[PDB]
Amino acid sequence: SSGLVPRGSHMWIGVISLFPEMFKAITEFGVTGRAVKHNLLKVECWNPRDFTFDKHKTVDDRPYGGGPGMLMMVQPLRDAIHTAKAAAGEGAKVIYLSPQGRKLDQGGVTELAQNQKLILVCGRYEGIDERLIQTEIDEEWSIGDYVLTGGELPAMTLIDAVARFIPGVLGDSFADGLLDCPHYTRPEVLEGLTVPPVLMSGHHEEIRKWRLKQSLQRTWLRRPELLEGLALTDEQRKLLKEAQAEHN
Amino acid sequence: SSGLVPRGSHMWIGVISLFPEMFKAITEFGVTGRAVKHNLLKVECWNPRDFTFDKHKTVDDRPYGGGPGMLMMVQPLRDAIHTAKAAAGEGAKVIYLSPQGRKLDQGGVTELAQNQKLILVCGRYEGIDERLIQTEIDEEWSIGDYVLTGGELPAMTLIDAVARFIPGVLGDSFADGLLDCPHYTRPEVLEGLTVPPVLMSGHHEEIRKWRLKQSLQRTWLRRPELLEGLALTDEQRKLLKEAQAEHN
Ligand SMILES: NCc1ccc(Cn2ccc3cc(C(N)=O)cnc32)cc1
Ligand SMILES: NCc1ccc(Cn2ccc3cc(C(N)=O)cnc32)cc1
């Protein structure tokens, strides 16, 4: 592999999925597409269908104890995992995406971004055998408290979020642990609604302060619990107090 | 439109995205692919690139007040939105995906699933003008407290999660508000690890109770805060107490 782009901190991400072609949504488009093309980011997929030996290529199996749903068939999933780890070498941490996992947040994205090598195991049906979690999975993660039709979109979300921490991928994110300020672009006036004059002012320091005050007001009004995790700066305590006083 | 599949509660979801081909990950594969093919689910995309008039088809614009990033250019995004609403008719609620939004959870998925018609607006760059949120967006939602390279994966996650609530899409999800029990499938013994005998027992009622006890133990050990939102049943208080006593 070759090219001119500093790829010092490049990431390799293996994927186990019955729907590998879904990952085209991240590998062929936009910033993540650029990361793949410039060898900042490598996503390599294995399909458990390819690790079957029966005529029909069965990748699901019946739960012990009855139930409504299927699970991922152990042998083809176990084999796909073992092939991904052999390709990867020492180091590669294996992640199972599931709703039973550690809740992903940006802090967790930056821990996950320290790994040079991830293997993301995508579950379909009602999930995978507990013994494979025990013996093959380093960490279980959720992207959030909702149920989806498989692990692919969780895995794609994880990939995109860690890719942003790869130096060179971007061309800030929960700046200061707060929600973002309002943004404006052209035109000056839109449906009789105008851009805050301060943003037209040219004064970078009065603009820094307006954005920070707005972030604090917006975190306060919508996600108060996010303030509780922060030791606010003296400036931040002052702008928050002010925004609260202009509310009342 | 035609076919034999009861589509009583069918959903129509408009999408505004500069990368419409990303939505192929949900419309051409698996359960969501089946929903689209059987007319349970319709995803229709508009690209703001198509609503440009300049030679180069500019879809980004400079923030007022300076900054590192671009925003979505207002005119082509505003026009794409207005075309999606005209196609949709009365009713269609417009959603902006962003980290500043209401946090998605399964409860929120079932509120969102009541709409027969959604329009999902996907932001790229540092986001969209505040005046369009004011005048075009009914609701702002986050899939979680992490920053991504655009709204597409959030929008795809939202679509997949609401699709599951469309009668006929599936072939339970935070059953009882708890994490899932362990599952097992073949083989009986795997790396010297065996399936809980109870799951082999045939006794449906002793199995119901083991799964529920395990859900409560697993919610307790990993997501205690999820218990606080619940009024547990008498049976649930009893199985939780027992699991806590077998821990200590
Ligand atoms: N038996 C219950 C059941 C669990 C999981 C699924 C699908 N699914 C797979 C991986 C994953 C992650 C998430 C998330 N929140 O990360 C959600 N759904 C997921 C379906 C049924
Ligand atoms: N200026 C800050 C900034 C905000 C948003 C993005 C990308 N992005 C668009 C929509 C969206 C939803 C989420 C989520 N959590 O739903 C995350 N990122 C998203 C990039 C920078």
* DSSP one-letter string for B161-230: HHHTTSTTS---TTGGGSPPPP---S-SEETTEE--HHHHS--HHHHHHHHHHHHHHHHHHH-HHHHHT-
Q: Which chain A residue has its CA at the smallest distance from B211's CA?
A: A65
- Distance CA(B179)–CA(B218), nearest Å, equals 6
- Distance CA(A48)–CA(B94), nearest Å, equals 38
| Cβ of residue A159 closer than 8 Å to a chain B Cβ | no
- Distance CA(B165)–CA(B167), nearest Å, equals 6
- Measured from the Cα of A125, ligand 1's closest atom is 20
Domain boundary assignment for chain B: 11-164, 176-247
Helix ranges restricted to H, chain A: 24-27, 30-37, 74-88, 106-112, 130-136, 152-163, 197-200, 204-222, 224-228, 234-247
Instruction: Choose among A63, A106, A108: nearest Cβ to B183.
Output: A63
- Distance CA(A115)–CA(A46), nearest Å, equals 20
- Distance CA(B154)–CA(B109), nearest Å, equals 13
Method: X-ray
Instruction: Choose among A62, A146, A185: nearest Cβ to B64.
Output: A185
Q: Residue A229 half-sphere exposure, CB side, CA atoms within 13 Å?
A: 11
Which residues neighbour A101 within 8 Å (Cβ) at sequence distance 6 or greater? A139, A140, A141, A142
Residues linked to residue A97 through DSSP beta bridges, in sequence order: A141
**Tokens of residue B99, six digits:** 């980290």
Taking a C-beta distance cutoff of 8 angstroms, is the pair A99, A40 a contact? no
Q: Residue A94 half-sphere exposure, CB side, CA atoms within 13 Å?
A: 22
E-assigned strands of B69-138? 71-72, 93-103, 117-121
Other beta carbons within 10 Å of A91: 10
Give CA B209 to chain center in angstroms. 30
- Measured from the Cα of B142, ligand 2's closest atom is 16
Q: Measuring CA to CA, which residue among A168, A164, A146 is closest to residue A106?
A: A164
- Distance CA(A157)–CA(B147), nearest Å, equals 10
- Distance CA(B111)–CA(B103), nearest Å, equals 13
- Measured from the Cα of A145, ligand 1's closest atom is 15
Pairing mode of beta strands A71-72, A60-61: antiparallel
> Looking at this protein, which amino acid is placed at residue A83?
T
**Tokens of residue A220, six digits:** 């306060």
Q: Is the CB of residue A64 below 6 angstroms from any atom belonging to ligand 1?
A: no
- Distance CA(A202)–CA(B112), nearest Å, equals 42
Q: DSSP label at A166?
A: S
Give CA B145 to chain center in angstroms. 14
- Distance CA(B64)–CA(A96), nearest Å, equals 42
Instruction: Choose among B29, B161, B200: nearest Cβ to A22.
Output: B29
Q: DSSP 3-state assignment of B136?
A: helix
Q: Is the CB of residue A108 below 6 angstroms from any atom belonging to ligand 1?
A: no
Token pair 């990303």 is found at B22
What b-and-e string marks burial along A185-211, b requiring 16 or more CB atoms within 10 Å of the CB? beeeebeeeebeeebeeeeeeebebbb
Token pair 């509310």 is found at A247
Q: DSSP label at B18?
A: S
Q: Give B11-164's CATH code, choosing from 3.40.1280.10, 3.40.50.12280, 3.40.50.720, 3.40.190.10.
A: 3.40.1280.10
Q: DSSP label at A187?
A: -
- Entry resolution in angstroms? 2.4
Q: Which of B148, B208, B210, B218 to mutate to test the interface with A (most CBs of A within 10 A)?
A: B148
Annotated binding site of A: 123, 143-148
Tell me if B109 is assigned to a ligand binding site: no
| Cβ of residue B116 closer than 8 Å to a chain A Cβ | no
Q: Measuring CA to CA, which residue among A179, A174, A194 is closest to residue A243?
A: A179
Question: What separation in Å is there between the alpha carbon of B102 and the centre of ligand 2?
Answer: 13
Pairing mode of beta strands A189-190, A193-194: antiparallel
Q: Residue A187: is the preceding peptide bond cis (ω within 30°)?
A: yes
Q: Which helix (H) or strand (E) holds B154?
A: helix B152-163
Q: Which helix (H) or strand (E) holds A28?
A: none
Pairing mode of beta strands B71-72, A139-142: unpaired
Mutate to test the pocket of ligand 1, among A18, A121, A147, A160 (most ligand atoms within 8 A of CB): A147
**A235 Ramachandran zone, left/alpha/beta (phi>0; psi -120 to 50):** alpha
- Distance CA(B65)–CA(A184), nearest Å, equals 8
Taking a C-beta distance cutoff of 8 angstroms, is the pair A204, B64 a contact? no
- Distance CA(B229)–CA(B244), nearest Å, equals 19
**Tokens of residue B26, six digits:** 């949900």
Contact A145 B174 (CB under 8 A): yes
- Distance CA(A26)–CA(B22), nearest Å, equals 8
Other beta carbons within 10 Å of A184: 23
Other beta carbons within 10 Å of A13: 24
- Distance CA(A67)–CA(B199), nearest Å, equals 11
Contact B66 A222 (CB under 8 A): no
Q: Are domains A11-164 and A176-247 of this chain identical in fold?
A: no
Q: DSSP 3-state assignment of B103?
A: strand
**Tokens of residue B113, six digits:** 């699933």
E-assigned strands of B38-160? 41-46, 60-61, 71-72, 93-103, 117-121, 139-142
First to last CA, chain B: 60
| Cβ of residue B198 closer than 8 Å to a chain A Cβ | yes
Which residues neighbour A56 within 8 Å (Cβ) at sequence distance 6 or greater? none
Tell me if B148 is assigned to a ligand binding site: yes
Q: Measuring CA to CA, which residue among B185, B107, B176, B221 is closest to residue A126?
A: B185
Q: DSSP 3-state assignment of A172?
A: coil
First to last CA, chain A: 60
- Distance CA(B127)–CA(B77), nearest Å, equals 11
**A11 Ramachandran zone, left/alpha/beta (phi>0; psi -120 to 50):** beta
* CATH topology for the B176-247 domain: Trp Operon Repressor; Chain A (1.10.1270)
Helix B30-37 vs helix B152-163: crossing angle, to nearest 10: 70
**Tokens of residue A208, six digits:** 């820094």
Residues, chain A? 248
- Distance CA(B139)–CA(B104), nearest Å, equals 12
What residue's CA is closest to ligand 2, atom 17? B147
Annotated binding site of A for S-adenosyl-L-methionine: 123, 143-148
Q: Measuring CA to CA, which residue among B107, B104, B106, B87 is closest to residue B96?
A: B104
